[PDB]
């Protein structure tokens, strides 16, 4: 796998549908904690982003997401996020399409300007009622009163054990259902409406970029390998090589913050 930028820029100037797949690597450059290995108390994302964790300890899970929600307030998009958003505006005007498909739930791509955004794992700032299924944007801090001054990430912190009745409840008239985060947990499926948008993007894709992904979360991990198999060049921008890198035309190492501003110039 080549480490040559000049060869990349030659495909880049020509490409007309470009898909960018973005992973936790991009958010970690904003100082957003990706709990992917690092921990929230004695747990990582894999232990809490599960339907089982929510069934058995919904209080704990909400504490965790509450933490993550509040932490985002200070945080901002980085040079990698900006470069991708500028590129999409710039290329838009040349009749060229750019789409970002993100594994991230922090919405930093939105804040940066990105319009053609597919959030394959949902968002931190959307809830879903487990009684009626309405999906609602929710930016309220704290999301519910019983969570005010909870969600500390330091281990040893005792569980607030908020009864289920005082965790975020649906506000729809007549419902009262328990809300969950509208995030895709391990063991669950991605939204079918989202999967079709992606299927189409990956099929008619042009040049694929995979940025700050460790390439260990499926299905997102298969998306670029899909494209490469079709004879389409794929550039992997990551600080460190992955289990999929050897299937890609390019690997550029570095912080996506350092490499993308050039690559997408």
């Amino acid at each position: 796998p080549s480490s040559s930028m000049a060869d990349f820029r030659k495909f880049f100037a020509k490409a007309k549908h470009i898909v960018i797949i973005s992973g936790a690597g991009v958010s970690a450059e904003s100082g957003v904690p990706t709990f992917r290995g690092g921990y929230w108390r004695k747990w990582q994302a894999q232990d809490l982003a599960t339907p089982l964790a929510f069934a058995h300890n919904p209080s704990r899970v909400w504490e965790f997401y509450h933490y993550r929600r509040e932490v985002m307030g200070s945080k901002e998009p980085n040079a990698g996020h900006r470069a991708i958003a500028e590129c999409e505006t710039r290329l838009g005007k040349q009749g060229r399409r750019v789409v970002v498909i993100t594994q991230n739930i922090d919405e930093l791509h939105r804040k940066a300007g990105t319009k053609n955004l597919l959030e394959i794992h949902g968002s931190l700032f959307k809830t879903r009622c487990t009684s009626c299924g309405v999906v609602a944007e929710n930016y309220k801090s704290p999301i519910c009163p019983a969570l005010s001054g909870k969600g500390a990430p330091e281990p040893g912190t005792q569980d607030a054990s908020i009864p289920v009745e005082k965790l975020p409840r649906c506000e729809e008239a007549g419902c009262g259902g328990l809300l969950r985060p509208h995030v895709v947990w391990f063991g669950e499926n991605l939204d079918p409406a989202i999967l079709e948008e992606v299927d189409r993007e990956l099929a008619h894709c042009d040049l694929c970029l995979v940025v700050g992904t460790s390439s260990v979360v499926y299905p997102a991990a298969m998306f670029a390998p899909q494209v490469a198999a079709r004879g389409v060049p794929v550039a992997e921008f990551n600080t460190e090589t992955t289990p999929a890198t050897n299937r890609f035309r390019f690997h550029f190492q570095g912080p996506c913050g350092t490499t993308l501003p050039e690559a997408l110039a």
């Binding site: 894999q46 794992h121 895709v184 947990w185 391990f186 063991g187 669950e188 499926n189 991605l190 079918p192 999967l195 260990v216 979360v217 499926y218 299905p219």
Partner: peptide
């Protein structure tokens, strides 16, 4: 295919 999973 659609299942979220690690590995």
């Amino acid at each position: 295919y659609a299942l979220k999973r690690q590995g």
